[PDB]
Amino acid sequence: IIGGEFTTIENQPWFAAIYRRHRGGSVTYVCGGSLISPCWVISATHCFIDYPKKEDYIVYLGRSRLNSNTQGEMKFEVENLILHKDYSADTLAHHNDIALLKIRSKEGRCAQPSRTIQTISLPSMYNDPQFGTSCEITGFGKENSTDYLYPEQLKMTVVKLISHRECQQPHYYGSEVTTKMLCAADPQWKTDSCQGDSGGPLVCSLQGRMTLTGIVSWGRGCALKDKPGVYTRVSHFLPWIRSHT
Numbered sequence: 001i002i003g004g005e006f007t008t009i010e011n012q013p014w015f016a017a018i019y020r021r022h023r024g025g026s027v028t029y030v031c032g033g034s035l036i037s038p039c040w041v042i043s044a045t046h047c048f049i050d051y052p053k054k055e056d057y058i059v060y061l062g063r064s065r066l067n068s069n070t071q072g073e074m075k076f077e078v079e080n081l082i083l084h085k086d087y088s089a090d091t092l093a094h095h096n097d098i099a100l101l102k103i104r105s106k107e108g109r110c111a112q113p114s115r116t117i118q119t120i121s122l123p124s125m126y127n128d129p130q131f132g133t134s135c136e137i138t139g140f141g142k143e144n145s146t147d148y149l150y151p152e153q154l155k156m157t158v159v160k161l162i163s164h165r166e167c168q169q170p171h172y173y174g175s176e177v178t179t180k181m182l183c184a185a186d187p188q189w190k191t192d193s194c195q196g197d198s199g200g201p202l203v204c205s206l207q208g209r210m211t212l213t214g215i216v217s218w219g220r221g222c223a224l225k226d227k228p229g230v231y232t233r234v235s236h237f238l239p240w241i242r243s244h245t
């Protein structure tokens with residue numbers, strides 16, 4: 001997250017930190033995710049497409065820091081890694097960038113709700129917030145394009161939803177963005193999601209209710225003028241989400 005502020009997991013209880021195990025014992029951060037139900041985490045397919053091995057992933061819930069433990073956090077293995085069949089990636093754009101991760105603890109149990117661990121509501125069929133609506137994003141992603149390391153503390157920022165028409169302009173993304181995607185950015189181009197924030201949530205207060213409106217998917221650079229963040233439109237994937245869960 002470029003700009004924005006440091007926050008704690010208590011403020012983003014549905015946030016899931018996904019790591020990959022390596023040979024030797026070195027674990028590295030992969031992407032963000034969201035707890036949609038006690039046993040299910042939703043993320044982006046591009047995060048796992050190159051290494052589809054469920055055994056190599058570790059999902060953390062209730063975690064505020066990247067490389068240190070947080071009181072009340074819970075560790076989970078991945079029981080089932082469901083990637084979208086029609087996933088494809090063009091020059092910039094990622095299509096059908098959505099993934100489901102069925103989680104289970106060592107004891108075979110799912111997530112147990114607490115002050116630092118909660119689920120987020122999915123949207124209604126084709127019912128998104130009107131454009132111009134403010135939404136928040138969270139992640140352990142880069143703070144600047146020039147950084148090679150990720151921030152140690154979780155961050156968040158607020159961005160505004162941009163209409164499909166505006167995002168399809170020539171100077172923006174043109175015909176690369178589709179109706180299955182959502183654009184969002186800071187009107188002043190100061191804050192934005194970046195590398196590392198992928199798979200994380202785009203949360204919008206819809207009709208007095210926190211709703212998972214999008215999943216961080218792609219963008220040209222980070223916080224660049226006329227280059228909004230692009231998110232997977234959760235409302236258009238409800239049939240797919242329900243059929244696999």
Ligand SMILES: N=C(N)NC(=O)c1nc(Cl)c(N)nc1N
Nearest residue numbers: 193194195198217218219222229
């Ligand atoms: N402007 C944005 N919102 N950009 C990104 O979200 C993003 N950028 C880069 Cl450079 C990347 N590797 N992954 C991303 N998800």
